[PDB]
Design a protein around this ligand. Structure first.
Ligand SMILES: *[C@@H]1O[C@H](CO)[C@@H](O)[C@H](O)[C@H]1NC(C)=O
Ligand SMILES: *[C@@H]1O[C@H](CO)[C@@H](O)[C@H](O)[C@H]1NC(C)=O
Ligand SMILES: *[C@@H]1O[C@H](CO)[C@@H](O)[C@H](O)[C@H]1NC(C)=O
Ligand SMILES: *[C@@H]1O[C@H](CO)[C@@H](O)[C@H](O)[C@H]1NC(C)=O
Ligand SMILES: *[C@@H]1O[C@H](CO)[C@@H](O)[C@H](O)[C@H]1NC(C)=O
Lengths: 66, 50, 43, 75
């Protein structure tokens, strides 16, 4: 389903490899409406954590938080 | 009455560094001995209870 | 891979897999909490 | 200087005696330069918005002690 992966600044990880992390892979994709959303965030304070969690849960009903 | 007076900053805007005198202020709360009160003689134990 | 494997293996068990909450404002039957205890992916 | 004191504190009788106790803390402690400043947040049945009220009312307030004083919740 809709699954959100969000990171900060660890290991200098960008987002383009996370776009290309699932696309050509997952040959055994049985459900249809499965999408991934990769995001970065500068601030890991709990105000913005709860804010982005509510934004992604309101963001087309994301069922998995990473 | 003590030194190293530090304050917990605006941690909701770009701050993740913890407040270093947290256990210091907690130890101040641990040594809170009182003999006044309508409920009675209030004092925190080693577990922080009445 | 663990999330998609649990979702695909729960789709064969139960049909209505997407069951989410709309928003944080304005105030459980089959979850993957009790499903992916036995999971192994990519060996 | 000034100290914000925040609490989950809605029913106005303990607003009144809380402001009274703020006045009494600046009364029986001499004429020291510290001042007090109250902060009160109200009921939310959803605890997510309780934490929302806590974070957008108490972090910028720089409070030192937070008191939950509402037992009889219907949930
Ligand atoms: C985070 O925000 C600060 C202040 O605007 C800025 O200096 C810093 O470069 C930002 N980090 C990134 C890369 O988002
Ligand atoms: C504050 O604490 C430090 C140790 O953490 C101590 O060295 C110092 O003497 C204290 N206060 C000051 C700045 O004198
Ligand atoms: C002890 O019990 C008495 C009688 O209820 C009352 O003073 C109060 O509840 C308690 N505290 C003290 C030490 O007086
Ligand atoms: C794995 O766990 C699930 C939990 O529902 C169970 O249904 C399934 O039989 C288990 N698979 C085996 C055979 O180990
Ligand atoms: C002091 O107390 C009042 C009580 O409503 C509060 O609204 C205010 O934020 C506090 N002082 C300031 C200017 O922050």
């Amino acid at each position: 389903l809709n699954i959100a992966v969000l990171l900060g600044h660890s290991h200098d990880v960008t987002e383009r490899e996370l776009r290309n992390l699932w696309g050509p892979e997952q040959a055994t994709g049985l459900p249809l409406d499965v999408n991934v959303v990769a995001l970065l965030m500068n601030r890991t304070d709990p105000k913005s954590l709860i804010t982005h969690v509510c934004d992604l849960m309101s963001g087309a009903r994301i069922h998995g938080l990473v | 009455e003590k030194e190293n007076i530090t304050d917990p900053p605006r941690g909701c805007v770009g701050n993740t560094n913890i407040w270093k005198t947290g256990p210091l202020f907690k130890r101040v709360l641990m040594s809170s001995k009182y003999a006044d009160g309508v409920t009675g003689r209030v004092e925190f134990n080693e577990d922080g209870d009445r | 891979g663990i999330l998609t494997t649990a979702a695909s293996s729960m789709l064969e068990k139960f049909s209505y897999i997407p069951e989410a909450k709309a928003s944080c404002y304005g105030q459980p039957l089959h979850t993957l909490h009790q499903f992916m205890v036995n999971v192994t992916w990519d060996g | 200087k000034i100290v914000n004191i925040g609490a989950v504190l809605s029913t106005r009788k303990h607003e009144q005696m809380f402001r009274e106790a703020v006045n009494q803390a600046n009364k029986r402690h001499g004429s020291w330069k510290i001042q007090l400043n109250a902060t009160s947040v109200t009921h939310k049945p959803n605890a997510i918005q309780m934490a929302l009220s806590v974070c957008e009312d108490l972090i910028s307030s720089q409070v030192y002690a937070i008191l939950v004083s509402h037992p009889p919740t219907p949930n």
